[PDB]
Amino acid sequence: ARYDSLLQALGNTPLVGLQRLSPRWDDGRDGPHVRLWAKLEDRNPTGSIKDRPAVRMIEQAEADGLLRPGATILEPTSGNTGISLAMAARLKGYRLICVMPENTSVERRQLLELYGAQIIFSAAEGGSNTAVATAKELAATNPSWVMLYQYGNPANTDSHYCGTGPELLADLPEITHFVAGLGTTGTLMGTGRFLREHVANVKIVAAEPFVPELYDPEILTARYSVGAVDAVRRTRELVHTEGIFAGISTGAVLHAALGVGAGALAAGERADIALVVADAGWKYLSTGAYAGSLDDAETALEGQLW
Amino acid sequence: ARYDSLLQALGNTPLVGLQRLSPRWDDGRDGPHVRLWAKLEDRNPTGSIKDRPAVRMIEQAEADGLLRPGATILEPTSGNTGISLAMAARLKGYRLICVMPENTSVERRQLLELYGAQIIFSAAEGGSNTAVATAKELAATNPSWVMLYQYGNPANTDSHYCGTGPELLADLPEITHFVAGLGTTGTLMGTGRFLREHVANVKIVAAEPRYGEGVYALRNMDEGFVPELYDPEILTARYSVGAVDAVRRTRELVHTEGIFAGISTGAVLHAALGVGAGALAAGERADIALVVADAGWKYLSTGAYAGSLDDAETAL
Ligand SMILES: O=C(Nc1cccc(C(=O)O)c1)Nc1cccc(-c2ccccc2)c1
Ligand SMILES: O=C(Nc1cccc(C(=O)O)c1)Nc1cccc(-c2ccccc2)c1
Ligand SMILES: *Cc1c(COP(=O)(O)O)cnc(C)c1O
Ligand SMILES: *Cc1c(COP(=O)(O)O)cnc(C)c1O
């Protein structure tokens, strides 16, 4: 039971109980359990959940006759999707050009450069909006370049509808809540549609810091915006208490999941809350979030622009 | 794949065929196949193979009655073993103190600290030996303080005898060669013993740094030190690999197979490719399993992964 390619060693990620951070691991006289379960999407080829949509988008574009050998793929990305696409591009014989905001971490730049991706740096003030606009123009100018367009490509949502969701349901049939970051919206749209088909009364909860064409607000039951200090606090808590060295979006997710769990606890409801760990902490070390005390980390955040 | 504890989501790592890098993936008229298979030990809780010996050493100490609630583990390490023990100790309710020389890099320190290790800095001038002597002395002060000593602890070897080896035999029954780095020697000793017991004519091959180059190799072990775990009869061959070759191999691995590996993996691959070239020249069939002990992440600051391989290959 083995692989012929790194591309097959993707998905089927572990789901791990957070016995210490869970509001109440054990059912007892105070009330039923309120458990958190972490889906470890860092156990993927390039260490993030984006391997799932990146590979599916390329393979869907290949099946649709859109890609020839030595073709250039052009993608607007804040990093993880670019890295995933860079890895798949190396394996499959394509060139990759990423359009990224200029204020992305040094680690993301390093990984992209190592895989041989080229980078266009669009204005920080314009964010993902300007990155996308810039990629669109370049793609119009260069019709042979293939823009997969993670923000609107249904193979993104499909990768979660066919992978993340089925896996979660098999590991956690008692699931009551799924919590994840809301970026491209692929994870929540695909996983959330799958869960809603299969599980009566399941709740689909977004955490977050133009509107992607993938987004359907009807799939979400709740949406929470999380500040940088709370995301950092939670990220640190996760590695200190549960030994899971996660990226900062996972702290945002954990903040949201702990808010949901506190709500279940107060209502004496049973809850089994799955949350996405989208990547590990390696690419975020240069932020200072993991060093020293929380006091130090909060101080280190002053002046940073992500 | 549901686990109540992170400690259970350890081992059973993937084995990936390297079709592009292999000397000859398909059998045929030119001769039998010579295939490389990469064992991805970065798919472990802390991203390295050391999660195996670390957890097993703690569990064996527990079983032996050496570790009770509130105990402190002591280990002279600034590396992957310290990271792994920090994670595992924290999860099982123990304190960890890592003993290391005063001049240890801040990078290594930060990875240990974020997993909750405490650190005692032994005298810079004495290097590794003084760290080990200090850890021993500290452990001897207090029945609650226990040194595991990864270079001599048979639970290090046993983690591979009971995990890595069996997993390889299960995924690659046709295995002819196993290649890994030679550090504590746990990987090669335990996996090698296991495979030798089950596979006729299996070859166990070490990769290691050249003499006088352990520093560039990113390990703090002394030159003429022989781990108590080491048994030279287990090995068929040893490849001493230079720093430039290790870095080149690390890059070829990422470029041809997409695997972002740590530096020791480059040395391992160099060795495996040598073994492979020998099997090819002798028209023998080979299925060569090699260890990816960790991923590239913690080595980004070395400059070994810079876009230009010509600059990167001298970075160590
Ligand atoms: O949505 C993303 N990442 C994302 C979005 C779209 C594209 C990509 C990409 O890799 O190209 C990444 N991250 C995310 C999601 C949810 C919460 C947070 C977050 C919130 C507060 C502090 C830090 C991060 C960050
Ligand atoms: O043995 C190790 N690392 C090691 C040993 C014992 C403990 C630890 C640890 O991080 O805890 C690491 N590395 C290794 C093994 C084999 C070859 C190489 C190598 C050789 C040439 C250039 C670069 C690395 C490096
Ligand atoms: C992409 C990503 C998210 C959000 O997932 P989407 O499916 O794009 O909504 C969250 N965290 C990290 C680290 C990501 O890369
Ligand atoms: C430990 C280690 C080795 C050597 O393995 P041993 O089992 O200690 O011989 C090689 N590379 C890395 C990255 C390691 O952590």
Side-chain angles (χ1 to χ4, degrees):
Chain A
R2 50 154 86 150
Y3 305 92
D4 268 27
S5 166
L6 189 60
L7 295 179
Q8 299 159 18
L10 180 163
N12 291 308
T13 52
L15 185 73
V16 177
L18 304 186
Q19 297 188 55
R20 300 223 274 253
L21 285 185
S22 286
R24 191 147 68 210
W25 190 261
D26 297 307
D27 295 278
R29 307 308 85 110
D30 271 309
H33 70 245
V34 177
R35 286 176 177 158
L36 305 171
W37 298 92
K39 176 69 151 167
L40 304 185
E41 295 295 320
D42 63 302
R43 306 270 194 111
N44 272 309
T46 68
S48 88
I49 198 172
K50 298 296 203 306
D51 290 336
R52 293 176 185 266
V55 171
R56 194 173 191 111
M57 287 185 298
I58 290 163
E59 294 186 329
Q60 188 65 53
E62 289 175 325
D64 294 359
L66 302 168
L67 282 167
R68 60 92 179 170
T72 295
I73 293 173
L74 171 72
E75 190 61 17
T77 176
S78 55
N80 277 338
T81 297
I83 296 163
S84 296
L85 288 175
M87 175 270 301
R90 281 298 324 176
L91 274 33
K92 294 175 166 278
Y94 312 122
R95 297 179 66 84
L96 177 63
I97 302 175
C98 295
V99 185
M100 317 182 73
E102 71 201 338
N103 64 322
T104 33
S105 67
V106 67
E107 293 93 330
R108 280 170 185 320
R109 285 151 38 204
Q110 284 181 111
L111 256 295
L112 286 165
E113 290 183 292
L114 169 66
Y115 279 107
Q118 290 177 303
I119 308 163
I120 302 159
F121 291 103
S122 46
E125 299 79 3
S128 73
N129 190 262
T130 295
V132 165
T134 304
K136 284 187 191 211
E137 284 180 40
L138 289 160
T141 301
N142 293 280
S144 68
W145 290 7
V146 175
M147 186 175 54
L148 296 172
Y149 190 60
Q150 59 176 327
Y151 301 100
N153 186 324
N156 176 356
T157 291
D158 294 350
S159 72
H160 301 289
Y161 189 80
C162 301
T164 313
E167 294 166 25
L168 200 49
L169 190 67
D171 287 337
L172 198 65
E174 66 268 48
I175 182 167
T176 58
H177 299 73
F178 175 64
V179 186
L182 183 69
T184 70
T185 78
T187 299
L188 286 157
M189 298 302 103
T191 316
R193 179 156 66 261
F194 178 91
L195 290 173
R196 287 160 64 90
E197 293 167 344
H198 288 82
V199 181
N201 199 50
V202 72
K203 303 315 188 193
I204 306 310
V205 178
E208 70 189 338
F210 77 104
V211 175
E213 290 85 354
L214 294 179
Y215 183 54
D216 174 4
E218 308 277 56
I219 293 297
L220 303 185
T221 66
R223 167 210 279 247
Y224 296 112
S225 79
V226 180
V229 173
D230 283 329
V232 162
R233 170 157 75 91
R234 263 57 164 103
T235 295
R236 295 166 58 92
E237 217 174 338
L238 190 61
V239 62
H240 298 335
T241 308
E242 300 286 357
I244 293 167
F245 177 39
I248 300 181
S249 82
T250 302
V253 168
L254 182 52
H255 191 72
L258 284 165
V260 163
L265 192 69
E269 291 172 1
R270 170 195 63 94
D272 279 283
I273 299 162
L275 64 96
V276 172
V277 178
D279 66 358
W282 303 112
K283 297 196 305 296
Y284 306 96
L285 281 168
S286 67
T287 72
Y290 302 90
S293 66
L294 182 60
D295 195 359
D296 298 329
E298 294 181 34
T299 294
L301 261 39
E302 294 153 11
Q304 284 189 46
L305 283 61
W306 290 349
Chain B
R2 187 228 272 202
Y3 305 96
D4 281 12
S5 174
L6 185 63
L7 290 198
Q8 301 160 342
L10 177 158
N12 294 301
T13 52
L15 187 65
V16 179
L18 308 187
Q19 294 187 52
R20 295 72 146 158
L21 215 51
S22 288
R24 215 222 314 285
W25 190 259
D26 305 302
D27 297 87
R29 178 209 311 156
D30 303 308
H33 68 239
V34 177
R35 291 180 172 166
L36 304 180
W37 299 87
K39 179 67 160 163
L40 301 189
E41 296 291 319
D42 61 316
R43 305 276 184 111
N44 274 310
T46 69
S48 92
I49 200 172
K50 293 297 201 305
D51 289 343
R52 296 176 188 266
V55 171
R56 201 181 180 99
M57 288 185 297
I58 290 168
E59 293 191 335
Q60 193 66 57
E62 285 180 329
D64 295 349
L66 304 161
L67 275 186
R68 300 200 200 288
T72 296
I73 304 164
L74 275 284
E75 186 74 8
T77 177
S78 56
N80 287 337
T81 293
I83 293 165
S84 294
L85 288 169
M87 174 275 310
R90 168 58 44 92
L91 286 177
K92 293 174 137 285
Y94 305 116
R95 296 158 198 287
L96 176 68
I97 303 174
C98 291
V99 186
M100 70 199 64
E102 283 175 303
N103 61 342
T104 300
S105 67
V106 164
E107 294 97 296
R108 288 171 177 279
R109 288 147 56 169
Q110 51 140 34
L111 301 187
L112 296 175
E113 285 164 352
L114 67 80
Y115 277 103
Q118 289 191 3
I119 299 173
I120 288 169
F121 296 102
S122 56
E125 183 184 39
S128 288
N129 192 49
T130 295
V132 173
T134 300
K136 254 162 208 185
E137 283 166 1
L138 290 177
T141 65
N142 191 325
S144 295
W145 286 24
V146 180
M147 179 168 81
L148 297 175
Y149 188 63
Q150 63 179 323
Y151 300 103
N153 194 317
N156 177 353
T157 297
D158 284 339
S159 75
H160 299 287
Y161 184 81
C162 300
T164 315
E167 299 170 23
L168 280 167
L169 186 59
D171 295 348
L172 197 65
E174 70 266 46
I175 189 176
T176 57
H177 297 82
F178 176 61
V179 193
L182 185 71
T184 72
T185 79
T187 301
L188 290 158
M189 296 305 101
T191 309
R193 193 204 278 237
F194 180 84
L195 293 168
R196 280 160 73 75
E197 292 176 355
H198 295 76
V199 180
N201 209 221
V202 70
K203 306 293 169 78
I204 306 308
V205 174
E208 63 199 36
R210 288 178 179 165
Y211 178 82
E213 274 167 60
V215 47
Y216 309 156
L218 311 174
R219 47 176 228 190
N220 312 314
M221 301 179 55
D222 290 345
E223 324 82 46
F225 172 72
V226 185
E228 292 86 345
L229 295 175
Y230 182 60
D231 179 0
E233 296 209 282
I234 294 292
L235 305 179
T236 304
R238 298 163 66 182
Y239 280 75
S240 166
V241 180
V244 168
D245 283 333
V247 177
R248 289 183 175 177
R249 265 44 166 111
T250 306
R251 189 68 57 102
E252 298 159 359
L253 182 55
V254 310
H255 286 171
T256 66
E257 299 284 348
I259 297 174
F260 175 44
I263 303 285
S264 76
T265 302
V268 167
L269 179 54
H270 189 82
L273 286 167
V275 164
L280 190 66
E284 305 176 332
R285 182 210 126 234
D287 277 286
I288 299 154
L290 68 92
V291 171
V292 178
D294 67 359
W297 302 107
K298 71 174 64 70
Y299 305 101
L300 283 169
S301 76
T302 71
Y305 300 86
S308 162
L309 183 54
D310 293 6
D311 305 328
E313 71 190 28
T314 58
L316 309 175

